[PDB]
Motif scaffolding. Structure first.
Motif, short mmCIF file in Angstrom:
data_model
loop_
_atom_site.label_atom_id
_atom_site.label_comp_id
_atom_site.label_asym_id
_atom_site.label_seq_id
_atom_site.Cartn_x
_atom_site.Cartn_y
_atom_site.Cartn_z
N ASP E 20 -29.01 15.68 -61.13
CA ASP E 20 -29.00 17.17 -61.12
C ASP E 20 -27.62 17.68 -60.69
O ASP E 20 -26.90 16.92 -60.03
N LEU E 21 -27.26 18.91 -61.08
CA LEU E 21 -25.97 19.52 -60.65
C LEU E 21 -26.02 19.83 -59.15
O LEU E 21 -27.10 20.20 -58.66
N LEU E 22 -24.88 19.72 -58.45
CA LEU E 22 -24.85 19.93 -56.97
C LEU E 22 -24.07 21.20 -56.62
O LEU E 22 -22.98 21.40 -57.19
N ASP E 23 -24.60 21.99 -55.68
CA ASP E 23 -23.94 23.26 -55.26
C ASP E 23 -22.70 22.95 -54.41
O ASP E 23 -22.53 21.78 -54.03
N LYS E 24 -21.88 23.97 -54.15
CA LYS E 24 -20.61 23.76 -53.39
C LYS E 24 -20.91 23.18 -52.01
O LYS E 24 -20.11 22.34 -51.55
N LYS E 25 -21.99 23.62 -51.37
CA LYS E 25 -22.31 23.15 -49.99
C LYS E 25 -22.51 21.63 -50.01
O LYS E 25 -21.96 20.95 -49.12
N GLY E 26 -23.22 21.11 -51.02
CA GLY E 26 -23.44 19.66 -51.14
C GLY E 26 -22.12 18.92 -51.34
O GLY E 26 -21.93 17.87 -50.68
N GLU E 27 -21.23 19.47 -52.16
CA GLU E 27 -19.91 18.84 -52.40
C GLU E 27 -19.14 18.80 -51.07
O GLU E 27 -18.56 17.74 -50.76
N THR E 28 -19.19 19.89 -50.30
CA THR E 28 -18.45 19.94 -49.01
C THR E 28 -19.02 18.88 -48.07
O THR E 28 -18.22 18.16 -47.44
N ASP E 29 -20.35 18.74 -48.04
CA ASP E 29 -20.99 17.73 -47.14
C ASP E 29 -20.54 16.33 -47.55
O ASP E 29 -20.16 15.54 -46.66
N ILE E 30 -20.52 16.05 -48.86
CA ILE E 30 -20.12 14.70 -49.35
C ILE E 30 -18.65 14.45 -48.97
O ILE E 30 -18.35 13.33 -48.50
N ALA E 31 -17.80 15.47 -49.12
CA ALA E 31 -16.37 15.32 -48.78
C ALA E 31 -16.23 15.01 -47.29
O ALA E 31 -15.47 14.08 -46.95
N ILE E 32 -16.98 15.71 -46.44
CA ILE E 32 -16.90 15.50 -44.97
C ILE E 32 -17.35 14.07 -44.66
O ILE E 32 -16.68 13.40 -43.85
N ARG E 33 -18.41 13.60 -45.33
CA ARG E 33 -18.92 12.23 -45.07
C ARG E 33 -17.84 11.21 -45.45
O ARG E 33 -17.55 10.32 -44.62
N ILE E 34 -17.20 11.40 -46.60
CA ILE E 34 -16.14 10.45 -47.05
C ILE E 34 -15.00 10.49 -46.04
O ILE E 34 -14.51 9.40 -45.66
N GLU E 35 -14.63 11.69 -45.58
CA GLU E 35 -13.50 11.83 -44.63
C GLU E 35 -13.83 11.08 -43.33
O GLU E 35 -12.95 10.34 -42.84
N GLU E 36 -15.06 11.24 -42.83
CA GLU E 36 -15.45 10.58 -41.56
C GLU E 36 -15.41 9.06 -41.75
O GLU E 36 -14.84 8.37 -40.87
N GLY E 37 -15.89 8.57 -42.89
CA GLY E 37 -15.85 7.11 -43.15
C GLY E 37 -14.42 6.61 -43.18
O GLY E 37 -14.14 5.56 -42.54
N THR E 38 -13.52 7.35 -43.84
CA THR E 38 -12.10 6.94 -43.93
C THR E 38 -11.48 6.93 -42.53
O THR E 38 -10.76 5.96 -42.21
N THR E 39 -11.79 7.94 -41.71
CA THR E 39 -11.22 8.01 -40.34
C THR E 39 -11.71 6.80 -39.54
O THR E 39 -10.88 6.16 -38.87
N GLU E 40 -13.00 6.46 -39.68
CA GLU E 40 -13.56 5.32 -38.92
C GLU E 40 -12.83 4.04 -39.35
O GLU E 40 -12.41 3.27 -38.45
N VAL E 41 -12.62 3.87 -40.66
CA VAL E 41 -11.96 2.62 -41.15
C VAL E 41 -10.54 2.56 -40.59
O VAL E 41 -10.15 1.49 -40.09
N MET E 270 -12.51 9.84 -61.74
CA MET E 270 -12.71 8.94 -60.57
C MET E 270 -11.47 8.96 -59.67
O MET E 270 -11.64 9.08 -58.44
N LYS E 271 -10.28 8.89 -60.26
CA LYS E 271 -9.02 8.92 -59.47
C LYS E 271 -8.89 10.28 -58.79
O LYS E 271 -8.53 10.30 -57.60
N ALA E 272 -9.21 11.37 -59.50
CA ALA E 272 -9.04 12.73 -58.95
C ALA E 272 -9.94 12.99 -57.74
O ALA E 272 -9.44 13.60 -56.78
N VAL E 273 -11.19 12.51 -57.76
CA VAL E 273 -12.15 12.87 -56.67
C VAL E 273 -11.65 12.40 -55.30
O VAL E 273 -11.77 13.19 -54.34
N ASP E 274 -11.09 11.19 -55.20
CA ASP E 274 -10.67 10.62 -53.88
C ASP E 274 -9.58 11.48 -53.22
O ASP E 274 -9.69 11.72 -52.00
N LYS E 275 -8.59 11.93 -53.99
CA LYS E 275 -7.44 12.71 -53.45
C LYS E 275 -7.88 14.07 -52.89
O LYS E 275 -7.37 14.45 -51.82
N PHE E 276 -8.82 14.77 -53.56
CA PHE E 276 -9.19 16.15 -53.14
C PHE E 276 -9.75 16.19 -51.72
O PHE E 276 -10.59 15.32 -51.38
#
Ligand SMILES: Nc1nc2c(ncn2[C@@H]2O[C@H](COP(=O)(O)OP(=O)(O)O)[C@@H](OP(=O)(O)OP(=O)(O)O)[C@H]2O)c(=O)[nH]1
Ligand SMILES: [Mg+2]
Ligand SMILES: [Zn+2]
Lengths: 102, 202, 53, 49, 470, 330, 49, 201
Positions: E20-41, E270-276
């Motif tokens: 299903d398509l995801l709203d902006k709030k869901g995209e922001t939550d996914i971005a925050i989760r990826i950022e927290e994982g990267t910081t932990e690593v 795929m390359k674009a999503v990681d940088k944003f």
DNA sequence: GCCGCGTCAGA
DNA sequence: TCTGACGCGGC
């Protein structure tokens, strides 16, 4: 009239061009081969197929012999058969010559 | 096109071939004979020669003419002198090293089981090196104005002897002039083993 | 006339050039000629020049 | 004396060439064929004059 | 559904469209989760001390490259390792080196905390973190390769036990080989090689730290963090899969089929999503869109024609074509080439003449010509690189004639000199010096002898016959 | 006696294909646009196929009688007669093994008879529509069982590991490799021993003959799926220029260029660890491209050029009245 | 179905090779001309047709 | 440009034939002859083992038949005994080395006057057994080399070496086991070559 | 055990 | 068009 003695050959098959557009020349029909088999003139059939059409080594040797006037015949193989083996070789199936002692 | 060479560990001729390939600067694939399956290893050569080299339509298992064939196949800077007289003399020198070198390495490797016997051989070898000390002096790699295949042959002996625990630089007589210079060539310096170590191993 | 390069003349040809002091042409001729067995007169001639020159 | 000289003389259709051709083809057989070779009789050999 | 439909595009789209398509709030939550994982690593990776020393060594290599630059007003600028994190960078590196040395010599916790805080202040996105992970990963990978080689050499040779893995698995002791001497695997050359490999492993451990277990747990933690980040990225990507199809619609007949265009779009997304980054408030669609568009245009240019054409050359040709289309409709005239050069950014006249020359795609040989005598283009093409038999025959007569002439002339010396200098049946075509050495005399006399032979052969009786060939 | 008195046809192993190939083509580049010369690793690349001119290197630095067999260090091209290019062959590495189109669509397909299963189910597994259990495990599910994706997930949850259900060409190749001819033939004959061939037994007769023929040949069953594909020589597929400043291009060249780029894209996707659905799509596209190259339109609509005429497959050239066997041989 | 030439040679091989060995029992069958041509032992001849 | 030679030596005879093909200035010196004892002593001073045949030049002195032949080929641009192609040259060199080790060493051992009957019989049997294989390999190599270049006017050293070995086999009185008329006729034709006759007489 | 639908392959 | 062969899915 379409008189032709020696003509350029097709790049892919090394075979003479036809229709008289450049040097032309008459194609030999498969049915004509059946008539030759009925006659039993194997020497005529073997020479026409190799030296006359696709034998690159044979054609040059034959021309030199005719100019020289000495008598020699070379018909090692037809290039078209080698091209067919290469086409089969590209596929998984393998075709090669072999000697059988059995 | 693509060329590959099969070599055996601790073989002087195999090291000589590797050094020649490095001087030729031709990219090649190097495969250890031991890693290959034993039946597969036997299949490549029935007699079983560790140093042969690999080509699509041709294979050479003869070490005596192998270096000459490698030089002729590649038109890169030659390992043989341009002058005809020097070229003739170099071949005679190579024959002299090849004709009687079995005692220097083979006898010590297998015949001298006794530690004293190895020691007895070492003293004679040192005296022979001292006798060779009164020979060519100031030669860049030998009796030639340019780097030669014979210089490559000396490198294989120097590494093999060093592996035999017989290292002589200032104790080897007055041959120190060319011994340090030989290691200078990039191809010769491939005998044995934070970022630098990893990059070098890569 | 159409130019040619890398003639790579064989040694016998080189000796023939040396004996007669004959230079090797870097160009070849491909003129238009009527096919054999054909005879005629030129009633009309048409020529088209280059553009922007 | 040369293949090229012979070709050049042949190009000009010299008179001596016709007599040589007549001598060469005096006893030489030729094969005549038709587009539909239904039977072996269709291909036959005749002496050309 | 599973209808057995042969076409792949229908099968692929059904799976892609399920999410299903995801709203902006869901995209922001996914971005925050990826950022927290990267910081932990990053926090786990910076914890090990040797990484700091390796970083200092890499900066020292950059310093040596800068010194090389001077030999060929400012220090040479190399910032590939650190992006948007050169005087400030150099000063920070000097402080880092002194602090690292002090921490190694005496400080246990405070200096380490200070270094971690300074690294956190330093900003890196993906490449530098990947390089640091490879730096930790590469040494372990090399040690594993050495262990595998040792196992292969000893396991088959040592009685092929295989089952008794733990005893062989003890590593770095290098004392089992002496007991194995009583047992099987009596390979003295193999034993020496194994001792050398274990010595290399001990040296690697000394540089990095203690036993393999010290790095193995770190690698496992890094793998778990990377897997979490990968799962978050995959969840974000699957929802945006349709973006490539939507962008692909505009170009469907540019010489590339829809499936390859969709693949190029997916690669760009795929390359674009990681940088944003979610720190700025904006939709991710535009960031993904630019990357997808660039990837599609690049793919079309690279595989647009059978013969590869430069992308820069293609773009100028496209601009020229657009200008021509505008001029023809506005003023009717098809070319107006002088007018075309009148208002263009190309700033060249020769380029346009050469630029449009490659405007024709290669024709297909098998392509039919309607009836045309029922003939095809491919059959017409003829070999022009191979000598014809008449061409072959004339060369043979000329070569045979010359040898007879040489015999008819000089008794032997002139013929030999002519063969050596020109080289007939001679592999090296020997020079004058070699021929002079061959006689051992007449080193300059050989040229005079050759000249005399040429004068004698230039006479009409021999010259006239050979003149026809030339 | 220097004469071959017999001709034999056999399947080609990957090692045999590697021996035949003189070089490996990584990138699909045919010719430089500015200059009509061979690309460095192109299908027309001079280094692998050979020199365009006789005894002349592509650089032309080595152009003398003194060096004939010498190989120029500057370029991979060897010094030899240009005729070698026609007989010279090349090979392309495949990241994922591709099942041969001819055996799968034999009608009767050999693979279907060997697996003793319907052709439609095998096609469904190849397309990734279904999952097949490669390893039986201690679980009840049969090795020859097709599992739905939800069913596969439920089986994994209930049993976890101990069973394998791979999909696509790799799973079929693994199933072919893990087959014991001696065990299967004896059980199949035992079914033959109880002969009831009024209806059911008649089908079983073909399988026994096929197994016996395979055992006699000694050819590996898994060889039918190709891990690597050889490339036909450039002279057989010429790109020679023609009047009007245009170059005639063979249909085979376009298929080869597409397959190489598709394989490169698949390798890049594997390197990037991209999503599984995209990887599955790339694998399916590569398989379709290989099928089209061997014979286009066999199981699908044939791909067509700008002219819209269907492209000519390698199989098409050897067959038909215009085919090589009856067109040029006779 | 098997070729008559193969059956006769196989019958001959076991005909006196050891004893009689019940070499073979066969009944003739009728096939179409195209079916007979495709059934030819030589693959090349069958492939060309 | 002086070559030291010993009569009844196969290697020396082959070197003399190679020089005769060159037709260069060869000052043949016999070590055995007492007429030139001082020159033989000078050869001993120059060469440690006094190996014969030894080619002597002011610039350098060389020993060993293969090295001497290679040096002669470099010195003279006269028709070569080696193939233009490097792979062919390598094959010819390997064949020459094999023929020299298998037959030349046996001939040298048989030359000694202290030979034992069993050793002589075994050597003769091995030489007869390998002679046919060596001749067949040489003929095949010659044909392959000829196919690459036509009318090269290049003489093959290996064929000359095989002819010399056959002549020595005849002189020793050894019997050749060939039942083929063609092989005997070809060997007779090689023996009948005019250039070979000058050294033999 | 079978009706009736289907692929292929040549003209 | 067609013929058949070969199919192979319904019952
Ligand atoms: N009399 C004589 N003999 C010759 C001549 N050339 C070669 N030989 C002998 O023939 C044998 C083969 O020598 P080569 O083929 O050159 O060397 P190789 O032993 O490495 O093959 C050698 O025996 P060897 O025992 O290996 O010799 P060495 O090298 O051990 O001294 C050598 O002594 C020659 O011109 N005259
Ligand atoms: Mg020896
Ligand atoms: Zn080059």
């Amino acid at each position: 009239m379409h008189a032709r003695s020696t003509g350029s050959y097709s790049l892919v098959t090394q075979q003479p061009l036809g229709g008289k557009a450049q040097f032309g020349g008459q194609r030999f029909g498969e049915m004509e081969v059946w008539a030759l088999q009925a006659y039993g003139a194997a020497y005529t059939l073997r020479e026409m197929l190799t030296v006359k059409s696709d034998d690159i080594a044979g054609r040059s040797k034959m021309y030199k012999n005719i100019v020289d006037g000495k008598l020699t015949m070379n018909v090692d193989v037809p290039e078209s058969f080698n091209v067919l083996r290469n086409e089969v070789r590209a596929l998984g199936i393998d075709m090669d010559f072999d000697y059988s002692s059995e | 096109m693509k060329v590959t060479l099969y070599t055996t560990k601790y073989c002087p001729y195999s090291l000589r071939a590797r050094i020649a390939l490095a001087e030729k600067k031709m990219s090649t694939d190097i495969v250890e004979a031991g890693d290959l399956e034993p039946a597969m290893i036997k299949k490549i050569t029935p007699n079983g020669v560790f140093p042969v080299l690999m080509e699509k339509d041709y294979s050479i298992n003869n070490r005596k003419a192998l270096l000459i064939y490698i030089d002729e196949r590649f038109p890169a800077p030659s390992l043989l002198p341009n002058v005809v007289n020097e070229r003739i003399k170099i071949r005679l020198s190579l024959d002299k090293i090849d004709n009687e070198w079995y005692p220097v390495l083979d006898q010590i490797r297998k015949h001298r089981s006794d530690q004293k016997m190895l020691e007895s051989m070492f003293k004679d070898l040192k005296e022979s090196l001292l006798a060779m000390e009164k020979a060519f002096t100031g030669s860049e790699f030998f009796i030639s104005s340019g780097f030669t295949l014979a210089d490559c042959y000396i490198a294989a002996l120097i590494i093999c002897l060093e592996a035999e625990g017989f290292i002589i630089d200032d104790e080897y007589g007055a041959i120190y002039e060319y011994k340090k210079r030989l290691f200078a060539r990039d191809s010769v310096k491939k005998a044995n083993i934070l970022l630098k170590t990893l990059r070098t191993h890569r | 006339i159409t130019p040619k390069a890398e003639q790579q003349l064989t040694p016998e040809e080189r000796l023939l050039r040396a004996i007669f002091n004959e230079k090797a042409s870097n160009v070849v001729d491909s003129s238009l000629r009527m096919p054999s067995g054909t005879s005629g007169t030129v009633i009309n001639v048409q020529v088209f020049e280059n553009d922007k020159g | 004396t040369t293949i090229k000289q012979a070709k050049r003389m042949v190009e000009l259709e010299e008179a001596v060439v016709w007599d040589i051709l007549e001598t060469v083809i005096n006893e030489h057989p030729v094969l005549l064929n038709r587009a539909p070779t239904l039977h072996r009789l269709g291909i036959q050999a005749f002496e050309p004059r | 559904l599973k209808g057995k439909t042969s076409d792949p595009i229908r099968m692929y789209m059904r799976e892609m469209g399920i999410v299903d398509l995801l709203d902006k709030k869901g995209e922001t939550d996914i971005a925050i989760r990826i950022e927290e994982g990267t910081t932990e690593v990053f926090s786990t990776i910076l914890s090990y001390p040797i990484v700091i020393k390796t970083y200092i060594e890499r900066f020292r290599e950059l310093e040596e490259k800068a010194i090389d630059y001077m030999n060929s007003e400012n220090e040479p600028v190399a910032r590939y390792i650190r992006f948007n994190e050169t005087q400030r960078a150099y000063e920070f590196f000097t402080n880092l080196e002194k602090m690292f040395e002090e921490y190694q010599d005496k400080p246990n916790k405070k200096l380490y905390t200070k270094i971690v805080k300074e690294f956190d202040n330093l900003r890196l996105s993906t490449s530098h973190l990947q390089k640091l992970v490879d730096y930790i990963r590469l040494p372990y990978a090399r040690v594993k390769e050495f262990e595998r080689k040792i196992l292969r050499l000893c396991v088959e040779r040592s009685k092929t036990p295989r089952q008794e893995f733990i005893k062989v698995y003890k590593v770095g002791s290098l004392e089992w080989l002496e007991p194995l001497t009583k047992k099987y695997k009596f390979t003295e050359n193999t034993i020496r090689e194994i001792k050398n490999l274990t010595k290399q492993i001990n040296q690697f451990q000394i540089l990095m730290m203690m036993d393999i277990e010290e790095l193995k747990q770190v690698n496992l933690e890094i793998s778990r963090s990377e897997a979490k980040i990968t799962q978050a990225k995959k969840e974000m990507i699957e929802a945006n899969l349709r973006l490539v199809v939507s962008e692909a619609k505009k170009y469907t007949n540019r010489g590339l089929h829809f499936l390859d265009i969709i693949q190029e779009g997916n690669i760009g997304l795929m390359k674009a999503v990681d940088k944003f980054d979610y720190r700025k408030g904006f939709k991710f669609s535009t960031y993904a869109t630019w990357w997808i568009r660039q990837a599609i245009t690049r793919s079309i240019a690279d595989q647009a024609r059978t013969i590869r054409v430069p992308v820069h050359m293609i773009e100028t040709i496209n601009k020229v074509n657009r200008i021509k289309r505008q001029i023809l409709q506005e003023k009717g005239r098809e070319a107006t080439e002088e007018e075309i050069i009148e208002h263009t950014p190309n700033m060249s006249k020769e380029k346009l003449k050469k630029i449009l020359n490659i405007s024709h795609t290669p024709i297909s040989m098998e392509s039919p010509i309607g009836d045309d005598e029922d003939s095809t283009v491919g059959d017409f093409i003829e070999d022009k690189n191979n000598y014809s038999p008449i061409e072959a025959a004339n060369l043979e007569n000329l070569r045979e004639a010359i040898k007879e002439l040489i015999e008819t002339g000089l008794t032997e010396r002139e013929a030999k000199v002519l063969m050596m200098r020109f080289g007939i049946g001679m592999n090296t075509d020997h020079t004058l010096e070699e021929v002079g050495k061959q006689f051992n005399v007449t080193r300059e006399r050989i040229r005079q002898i050759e000249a005399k032979a040429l004068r004698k052969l230039k006479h009409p009786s021999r010259s006239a016959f050979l003149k026809t060939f030339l | 006696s220097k004469k071959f008195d017999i001709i034999k046809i056999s399947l080609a192993s990957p090692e045999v294909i590697r021996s035949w190939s003189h070089g490996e083509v990584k990138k699909p580049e045919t010719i430089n646009y500015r200059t009509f010369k061979p690309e460095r690793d192109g299908l027309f690349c001079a280094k692998i196929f050979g020199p365009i001119k006789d005894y002349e290197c592509l650089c032309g630095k080595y152009k003398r009688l003194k060096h004939r067999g010498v190989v120029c260090e500057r370029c991979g091209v060897e010094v030899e007669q240009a005729k070698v290019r026609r007989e010279r062959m090349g090979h392309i590495d495949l990241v994922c093994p591709v099942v041969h189109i001819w055996y799968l669509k034999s009608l009767p397909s050999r693979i279907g008879l060997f697996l003793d299963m319907p052709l439609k189910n095998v096609e469904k597994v190849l397309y990734f529509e279904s999952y097949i259990v490669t390893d039986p495990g201690m679980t009840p599910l049969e090795k020859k069982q097709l599992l739905t994706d939800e069913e596969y997930a439920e089986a994994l949850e209930n049993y976890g590991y101990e069973f394998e259900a791979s999909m696509g060409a790799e799973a079929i190749r693994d199933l072919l490799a893990d087959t014991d001819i001696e065990s299967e033939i004896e059980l199949l004959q035992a079914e033959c021993e109880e002969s009831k061939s009024t209806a059911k037994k008649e089908k079983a007769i073909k399988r026994l003959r096929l197994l016996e023929t395979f055992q006699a040949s000694g050819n590996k069953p898994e060889w039918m799926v190709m891990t690597v594909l050889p490339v036909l020589p450039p002279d057989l597929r010429p790109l020679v220029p023609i009047e009007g400043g245009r170059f005639a291009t063979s249909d085979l060249n376009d298929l080869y260029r597409r397959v190489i780029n598709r394989n490169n894209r698949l390798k890049k996707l594997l390197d990037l660890n991209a999503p599984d659905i995209i990887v599955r799509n790339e694998k399916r596209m590569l398989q379709e491209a290989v099928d089209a190259l061997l014979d286009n339109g066999r199981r699908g609509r044939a791909v067509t050029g700008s002219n819209k005429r269907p492209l000519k497959s390698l199989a098409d050239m050897i067959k038909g009245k215009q085919g090589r066997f009856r067109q040029n041989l006779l | 179905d098997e070729s008559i030439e193969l059956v006769r040679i196989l019958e001959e091989n076991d005909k006196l090779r050891k004893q009689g060995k019940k070499e073979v029992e066969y009944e003739l069958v009728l096939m179409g001309i195209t079916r007979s041509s495709l059934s030819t032992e030589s693959f090349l001849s069958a492939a060309s047709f | 440009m002086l070559l030291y030679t010993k009569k009844d030596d196969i290697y020396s005879d082959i070197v003399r034939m190679i020089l005769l093909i060159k037709g260069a200035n060869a000052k043949i010196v016999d070590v055995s002859k007492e007429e030139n004892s001082k020159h033989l002593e000078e050869l001993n001073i120059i060469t440690p083992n006094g190996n014969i045949p030894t080619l002597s030049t002011d610039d350098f002195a060389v020993y060993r038949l293969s090295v001497i032949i290679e040096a002669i080929e470099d010195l003279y641009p006269f028709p070569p005994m080696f193939p233009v192609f490097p792979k062919q040259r390598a094959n010819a060199r390997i064949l020459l080395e094999y023929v020299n080790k298998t037959f030349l060493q046996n001939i040298i051992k048989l030359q000694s006057p202290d030979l034992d009957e069993k050793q002589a019989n075994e050597i003769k049997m091995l030489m007869q057994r390998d002679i046919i294989s060596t001749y067949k390999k040489i003929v095949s190599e010659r044909e392959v080399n000829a196919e690459s270049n036509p009318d090269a006017q290049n003489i093959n050293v290996l064929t000359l070496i095989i002819t010399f070995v056959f002549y020595y086999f005849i002189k020793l009185k050894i019997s050749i086991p060939t039942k083929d008329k063609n092989i005997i006729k070809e060997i007779k034709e090689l023996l009948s070559e005019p250039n070979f006759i000058k050294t033999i007489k």
